[PDB]
Amino acid sequence: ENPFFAPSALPYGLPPFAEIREEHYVPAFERGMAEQLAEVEAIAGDTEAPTFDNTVAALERSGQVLTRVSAVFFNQSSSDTNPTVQEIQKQIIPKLTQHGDAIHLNRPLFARIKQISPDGLDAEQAWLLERYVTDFVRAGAELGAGDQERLKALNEELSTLSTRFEQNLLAHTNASAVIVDDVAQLDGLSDDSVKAAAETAKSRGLPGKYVIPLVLPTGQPGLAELTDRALRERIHRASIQRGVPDNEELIVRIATLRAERAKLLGYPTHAAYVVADQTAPTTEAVTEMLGKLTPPAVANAHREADELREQAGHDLEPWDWSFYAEKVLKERYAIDGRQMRPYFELDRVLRDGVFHAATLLYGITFTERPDLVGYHPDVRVFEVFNEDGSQLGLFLGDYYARPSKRGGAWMNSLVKQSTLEGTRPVVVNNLNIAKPPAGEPTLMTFEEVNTMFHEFGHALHGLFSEVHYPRFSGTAVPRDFVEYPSQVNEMWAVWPSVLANYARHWQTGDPMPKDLLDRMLKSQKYNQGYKTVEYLAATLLDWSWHTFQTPPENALTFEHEALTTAGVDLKLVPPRYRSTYFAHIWSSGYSAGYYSYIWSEVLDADTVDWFHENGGLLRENGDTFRQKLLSKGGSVDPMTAFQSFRGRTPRIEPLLDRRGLL
Ligand SMILES: [Mg+2]
Numbered sequence: 242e243n244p245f246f247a248p249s250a251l252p253y254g255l256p257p258f259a260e261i262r263e264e265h266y267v268p269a270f271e272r273g274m275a276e277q278l279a280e281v282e283a284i285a286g287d288t289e290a291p292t293f294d295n296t297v298a299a300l301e302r303s304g305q306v307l308t309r310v311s312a313v314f315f316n317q318s319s320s321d322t323n324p325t326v327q328e329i330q331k332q333i334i335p336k337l338t339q340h341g342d343a344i345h346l347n348r349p350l351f352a353r354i355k356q357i358s359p360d361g362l363d364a365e366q367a368w369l370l371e372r373y374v375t376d377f378v379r380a381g382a383e384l385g386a387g388d389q390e391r392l393k394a395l396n397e398e399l400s401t402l403s404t405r406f407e408q409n410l411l412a413h414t415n416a417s418a419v420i421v422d423d424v425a426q427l428d429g430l431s432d433d434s435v436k437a438a439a440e441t442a443k444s445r446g447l448p449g450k451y452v453i454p455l456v457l458p459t460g461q462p463g464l465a466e467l468t469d470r471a472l473r474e475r476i477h478r479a480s481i482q483r484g485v486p487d488n489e490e491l492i493v494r495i496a497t498l499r500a501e502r503a504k505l506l507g508y509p510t511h512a513a514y515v516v517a518d519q520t521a522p523t524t525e526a527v528t529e530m531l532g533k534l535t536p537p538a539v540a541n542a543h544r545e546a547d548e549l550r551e552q553a554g555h556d557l558e559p560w561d562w563s564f565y566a567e568k569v570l571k572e573r574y575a576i577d578g579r580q581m582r583p584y585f586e587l588d589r590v591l592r593d594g595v596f597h598a599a600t601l602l603y604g605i606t607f608t609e610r611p612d613l614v615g616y617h618p619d620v621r622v623f624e625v626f627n628e629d630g631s632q633l634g635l636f637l638g639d640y641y642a643r644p645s646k647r648g649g650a651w652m653n654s655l656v657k658q659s660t661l662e663g664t665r666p667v668v669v670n671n672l673n674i675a676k677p678p679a680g681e682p683t684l685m686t687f688e689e690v691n692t693m694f695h696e697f698g699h700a701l702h703g704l705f706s707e708v709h710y711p712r713f714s715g716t717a718v719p720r721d722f723v724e725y726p727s728q729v730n731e732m733w734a735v736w737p738s739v740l741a742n743y744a745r746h747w748q749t750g751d752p753m754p755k756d757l758l759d760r761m762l763k764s765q766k767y768n769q770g771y772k773t774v775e776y777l778a779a780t781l782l783d784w785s786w787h788t789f790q791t792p793p794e795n796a797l798t799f800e801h802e803a804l805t806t807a808g809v810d811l812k813l814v815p816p817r818y819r820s821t822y823f824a825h826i827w828s829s830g831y832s833a834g835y836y837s838y839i840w841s842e843v844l845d846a847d848t849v850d851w852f853h854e855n856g857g858l859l860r861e862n863g864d865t866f867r868q869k870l871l872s873k874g875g876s877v878d879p880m881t882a883f884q885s886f887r888g889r890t891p892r893i894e895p896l897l898d899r900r901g902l903l
């Protein structure tokens with residue numbers, strides 16, 4: 242048989258990872274698709290009169306095996322893939338796309354859905370009925386037969402291309418890891434980072450050497466400390482050349498097909514299609530907001546560049562930026578990244594920072610379960626309880642980089658909460674922190690600390706879900722809203738009483754001196770020009786790829802012209818991702834949606850102010866935010882939820898102040 246064929250019997254429905262092997266995936270996908278198709282056919286051909294229960298709720302109940310195999314499989318393909326998994330992914334993804342379309346383009350099924358009245362439905366049920374109609378229409382249910390056939394082909398080709406992009410990027414990223422033969426070339430690097438590079442080299446089959454793998458964004462962390470300028474250049478060139486040339490024609494094809502798809506569905510661009518299901522009201526609203534932010538961000542980056550040139554005494558190349566920014570931080574604030582690292586050890590950050598803040602705010606508690614089996618041996622499983630002692634869900638943390646794990650950081654759910662199924666949330670966080678050798682502490686940069694709080698904010702959004710229908714569970718909200726609960730959770734990484742709790746030396750346990758911790762805080766306002774510009778440049782790049790009139794010929798030429806036209810082609814501030822490694826938009830779901838971060842950040846910064854207005858880190862406030870916003874998933878209109886919580890529509894001034902844009 243097959244461990245996907247029955248519900249998990251483990252706590253919280255944790256999948257039985259000890260019983261699951263690669264050979265189980267294809268038969269479970271095949272059984273799952275066949276059983277869901279049979280379910281949908283029974284609904285569509287039901288001789289009984291259409292009701293919410295026998296149509297919409299019946300669709301929500303369908304696909305139990307398929308949901309179980311997908312949850313594990315897609316978790317593995319992102320976090321701990323292998324050639325067998327990659328081959329399965331190539332085979333199955335097109336079939337899954339064709340499966341989704343066989344349901345959404347089932348004409349009698351859609352006719353049934355359209356016959357359901359909102360009369361006697363409760364609020365979430367009525368909202369779900371509209372959501373179902375919208376999902377079907379956006380998938381092509383109102384197209385004629387010829388256009389549906391072309392749509393099915395476009396979707397399948399898009400799914401295969403995005404898969405190839407992801408696989409290309411992983412292979413090229415891994416192959417572009419920078420090998421250093423002489424430890425002298427690592428001058429400037431903290432001792433702990435040297436040991437991690439030696440450990441990496443050992444793990445990747447090169448004992449005695451040192452390996453510096455690349456992180457997802459353009460900017461590589463080691464450039465802040467490495468004094469060997471030729472090595473800084475070599476790392477930066479390895480970064481910016483990811484996906485060249487193998488992703489260039491591929492992304493051109495993806496963007497071309499997206500445009501053709503969008504027109505087929507009645508939209509002038511892919512961005513117009515995307516924005517139609519975002520909280521942002523129009524494409525013009527997005528471009529108008531970006532147009533206001535870009536000139537002051539660019540002027541800040543120019544001032545910062547002048548300051549870095551004066552510090553260095555000479556002209557800079559892109560691979561010098563971080564290095565001289567660190568010198569300015571040390572001179573201005575007495576903050577040396579090498580001296581800050583010893584205060585931010587993973588276990589302490591996690592327990593006394595991330596968990597601690599959630600306990601103070603929400604009253605929830607955590608029990609580590611080293612006896613429960615995660616999907617990889619380094620996964621930590623935690624049981625999560627409400628303040629009253631009741632069971633809430635499971636949280637899995639997977640903190641370390643490895644060749645099988647894709648770049649960046651993310652949250653995903655193994656089990657979605659719904660009262661329909663009576664399921665409790667099982668959520669996952671993945672980071673890419675460099676793994677130390679045996680015995681050695683995991684000392685984190687503040688960027689990594691922030692990422693931990695960010696991903697945990699998504700975990701809380703999943704954990705706190707109290708919806709009826711799985712369609713609305715947890716993080717199932719528009720992309721330009723989903724980054725609000727994650728970004729707002731980062732507030733607790735810098736809330737001084739929390740930071741003071743976890744910023745303690747890994748050896749002595751001594752707190753950082755109050756006046757130094759003050760300066761570490763001040764020093765994070767530094768470099769907002771670079772940070773904002775690299776972000777805005779990537780946003781406008783995504784936008785250009787998904788609003789073009791005439792299709793691009795050359796990917797690299799297009800990128801250049803896109804950035805130049807948008808006034809963000811700065812030699813010293815490349816976009817946070819270049820086109821050929823922009824995983825957000827080519828393989829994850831942020832196409833014409835990378836603007837989502839800053840759109841959500843409006844809400845985040847305005848919410849920080851709400852906390853200050855209401856007395857700060859108090860249980861009453863956590864209960865309010867949980868009850869009014871985090872527990873709703875997609876089950877209410879998100880901006881309505883926000884307004885009920887905040888007391889009014891959002892204001893942008895708090896974001897503008899934060900990023901130096903006033
Ligand atoms: Mg002070």
Ligand SMILES: [Zn+2]
Binds near residue numbers: 695
């Ligand atoms: Zn996020």
